[PDB]
Design a protein around this ligand. Sequence first.
Ligand SMILES: CCCCCCCCC
Length: 241
Amino acid sequence: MRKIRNLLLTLYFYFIATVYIVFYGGFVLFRSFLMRDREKARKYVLKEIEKFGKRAFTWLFSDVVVEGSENIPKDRNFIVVANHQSLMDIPLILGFVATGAFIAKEELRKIPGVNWYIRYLNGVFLRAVRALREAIEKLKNGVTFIVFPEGTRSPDGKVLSFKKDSLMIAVKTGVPVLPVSIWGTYHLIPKGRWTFTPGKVFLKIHEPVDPKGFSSEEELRKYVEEVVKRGVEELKARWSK
Ligand SMILES: CCCCCCCCC
């Protein structure tokens, strides 16, 4: 019966999430297209995305809690660097940190609704990684990125090593890295499971890092890695309620 509840929750999530992304999200872009004033059209679409990020977790009866909102740069783009432990990490970062570009599986272009919004956020689909050039290029024009240097979701919640050259997009653009630590989306929906289970999600936003202060990509990566990791640990251990 705890199984019944979770499955029904799962159905409720996919149904609402799909109708919301496709039909309401179609409607959103459709209204934004009709807007004379292009700057506020952008604001409208962006705000709706952020609202989706947030609303997502309400559809799961899962409470988000954010600290370090004050650290998120304003007037400027950045590269969110986060640990990765669920599909829900993307809606989480979108709704509570930044509505930026991300790197999608080639697959995703074909899924309706999602592709329109990945494109709107100026995302980057995956010779074998030409990606890196668009990301760099997009960064230079001013797009915020969201980057999961581990390169995969942790299977057990534990933070994996940051893949070598993972912070190269910061090094080669000079845009600030905004380290973020996510805890609880893994208990919500873990790698390889297709069902949800409610729970609390915590998010800790850390002080922006300037790549300028680092003799190499490899030294920056290590700094950000300890920062993120330590967050996860503090978050994993905090009692609350
Ligand atoms: C109302 C528009 C919602 C779009 C959510 C986008 C999710 C991007 C993966």
